[PDB]
Amino acid sequence: CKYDFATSVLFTEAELHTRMRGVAQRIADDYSNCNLKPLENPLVIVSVLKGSFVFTADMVRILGDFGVPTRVEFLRGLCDIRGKHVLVLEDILDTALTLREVVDSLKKSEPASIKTLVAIDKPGGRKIPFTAEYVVADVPNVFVVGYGLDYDQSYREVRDVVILKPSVYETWG
Amino acid sequence: CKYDFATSVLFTEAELHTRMRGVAQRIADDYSNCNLKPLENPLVIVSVLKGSFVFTADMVRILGDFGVPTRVEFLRDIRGKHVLVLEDILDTALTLREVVDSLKKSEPASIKTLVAIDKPGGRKIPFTAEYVVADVPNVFVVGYGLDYDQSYREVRDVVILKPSVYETWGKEL
Ligand SMILES: Nc1nc2c(ncn2CCCCCCP(=O)(O)O)c(=O)[nH]1
Ligand SMILES: Nc1nc2c(ncn2CCCCCCP(=O)(O)O)c(=O)[nH]1
Ligand SMILES: [Mg+2]
Ligand SMILES: [Mg+2]
């Protein structure tokens, strides 16, 4: 493997960006009827979990390439969402307990609409039923780091999503 | 100009990244005597101002390429840790002065600052960042995380905003 701390590389930065451009085209199509505009009517991006800064930085730039103007809020997102379209971003979706709570909280402010976009979905991890509208990639029952995802606050800066070696968290634990 | 809301492009994404690679080499050299390591001894990145998520996401990935492992904290467990405060824009220096002086109370091993856009003609107190990606004159810019009323952060380049944008939007408000 390319990294001494990883068993294998699951998604390279380039693979993640190819997938994100595919998702951005779908988002551009799906919101084309909304007359989004900078200042007057941006898509409100609500980024959830500290590590999602990486995904959110890349995704809002790709969305801008596809003609979807945004404004960003971080929950790690309350003022001025009534009547606005909201897209909630999260780097990983596993049990879905966080995103369920966030979406329900935001619904109380009566946005025009709310959808979710996740970089890594672990659908085997659910503790409640939950389907994200947009998913960049799926991961099975494996522990990954990279692309914002940490192990004890390290490895968020790895450009790829990789499986962390057991010998790393075993020694550190 | 490729942007109808801008009168000039000052720094492209590519130019910013070239300059960030130059800075990351200097950081790798300057911190070589700190034996930075993931988990045991990461460089602590303290990202200040909401819009700095873009710079921070790119910069921690570039630092990783140069052998400088990080952990990230956001403002808008550090005693004996090296702290590098990141901010997308340095202007009056009032924010960074306050943040640096606050962090010093927690007895970090060292503290330095790294800014993406320095506007040296904006100072209201004396302040020199240790690392600067690019200097901008006294003009109002957006892009690369920098906003006008929460819009245009997703523009990939740092551009001078067209006066008609804020003259007109100013009258909407
Ligand atoms: N970095 C990392 N974290 C993981 C992994 N599997 C589970 N986690 C905790 C996720 C914490 C955030 C909560 C997300 P929800 O509420 O469970 O959907 C994984 O593979 N990698
Ligand atoms: N978007 C944008 N905002 C600007 C610009 N110049 C000043 N600002 C306010 C700065 C906000 C953060 C505070 C930085 P400090 O405390 O003055 O050093 C500029 O050129 N563009
Ligand atoms: Mg955390
Ligand atoms: Mg703000």
Author numbering:
A (entry chain B): 5 to 80, 100 to 196
B (entry chain A): 5 to 80, 103 to 199
Quote what the paper states about this structure:
Trypanosoma brucei is the protozoan parasite that is the causative agent of Human African Trypanosomiasis (HAT), also known as African sleeping sickness. However, in T. brucei there are no enzymes for de novo synthesis and this parasite relies solely on its salvage pathways to make its purine nucleoside monophosphates.
In the TbrHGPRT.3 complex, 3 adopts two conformations resulting in the phosphonate group occupying alternative positions in the 5′-phosphate binding site. In one of these, the oxygen atoms of the phosphonate moiety form hydrogen bonds with the amide nitrogen atoms of D117 and L120, the amide nitrogen and side chain hydroxyl of T118 and the side chain hydroxyl of T121. In the second conformation, the phosphonate moiety is translated by ~1.8 Å, resulting in the formation of additional hydrogen bonds to the side-chain of E113 and the amide nitrogen of T121, and the removal of hydrogen bonds to the side chain hydroxyl and the amide nitrogen of T118. As with GMP, the guanine base of 3 makes a π-π stacking interaction with the aromatic ring of F166, and forms hydrogen bonds to K145, the carbonyl oxygen of V167 and to the backbone carbonyl of D173. In this structure, the bond between L53 and K54 is in the trans conformation and the side-chain of L53 is in hydrophobic contact with the carbon atoms of the linker in this ANP.
